[PDB]
């Protein structure tokens, strides 16, 4: 049975930091990709970024939207995924999903629940 | 900068009746190597979290019921629901996977 829990959601104050994390189970989790996808409450699904695999070396991309203040981590010992976050601007406010990905299907074929996250003074 | 636009932005329906919703690429997601259409449909229903069902343009995932039917290649894409149901109500997303991933901005659909 394929798992994925989000978790470190909460207030926050723009600027600051905050540290997601993502775990995994009921599958190999170095044979696939990572991705993060957020909704903003009331808005589209947006995607951050993935992680790649094992065969691919694990090397990591980004949206050009959070290049740069976010970084994608994993923890294959663990089966662990992780999203730093860095300066959260108002607009990164969301519920944050992270997802299985890779180029069997070139699709997130499983989801977590996710974590929100509230930028509040 | 890939953008998909879909159609319409929101559609009510009673159960049992058939409705399209339309998926427009700005580049061509189809891939001549394998010759396949690099798309997904994701349904998300309200204050869940999203699923897929279909990739690669038609490929339906496994456990999505058969009344879920996707279609067409190039920039050119539709999700088909063949006698929609109580439980289809939620927000249908196409994304490209042809160059890292982008979403639409989704079709929503309701059930009156
Ligand atoms: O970024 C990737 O490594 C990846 O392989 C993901 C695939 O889903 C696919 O999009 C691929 C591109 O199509 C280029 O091959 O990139």
């Known amino acids: 049975e394929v798992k994925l829990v989000e978790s470190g959601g909460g207030l926050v104050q723009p600027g600051g930091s905050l540290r997601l994390s993502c775990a995994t189970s009921?599958?190999?989790?170095?044979?696939?990709?990572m991705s993060w996808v957020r909704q903003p409450p009331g808005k589209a699904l947006e995607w951050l970024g993935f992680i790649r695999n094992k065969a691919k070396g694990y090397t990591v991309e980004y949206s050009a939207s959070v290049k740069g203040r976010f970084t994608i981590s994993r923890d294959n010992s663990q089966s662990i995924l992780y999203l730093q976050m860095n300066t959260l601007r108002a607009e990164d406010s969301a519920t944050y999903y992270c997802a299985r990905d890779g180029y069997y299907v070139d699709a997130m074929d499983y989801w977590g629940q996710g974590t929100s996250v509230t930028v509040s003074s | 900068d890939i953008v998909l636009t879909q159609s319409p932005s929101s559609l009510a329906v009673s159960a049992g009746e058939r409705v399209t919703m339309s998926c427009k690429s700005s580049?061509?997601?189809?891939?001549?190597?394998?010759?396949?259409?690099?798309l997904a449909w994701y349904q998300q229903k309200p204050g869940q979290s999203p699923k897929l069902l279909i990739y690669?343009?038609?490929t339906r995932e496994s456990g999505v019921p058969d009344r879920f039917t996707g279609s067409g290649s190039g920039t050119d894409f539709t999700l088909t629901i063949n006698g929609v149901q109580a439980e289809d109500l939620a927000v249908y997303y196409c994304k490209q996977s042809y160059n890292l991933r982008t979403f639409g901005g989704g079709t929503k659909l309701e059930l009156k």
């Open positions: 580049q061509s997601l189809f891939k001549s190597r394998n010759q396949k259409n690099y």
């Open positions: 690669w343009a038609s």
């Open positions: 009921g599958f190999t989790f170095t044979d696939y990709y």
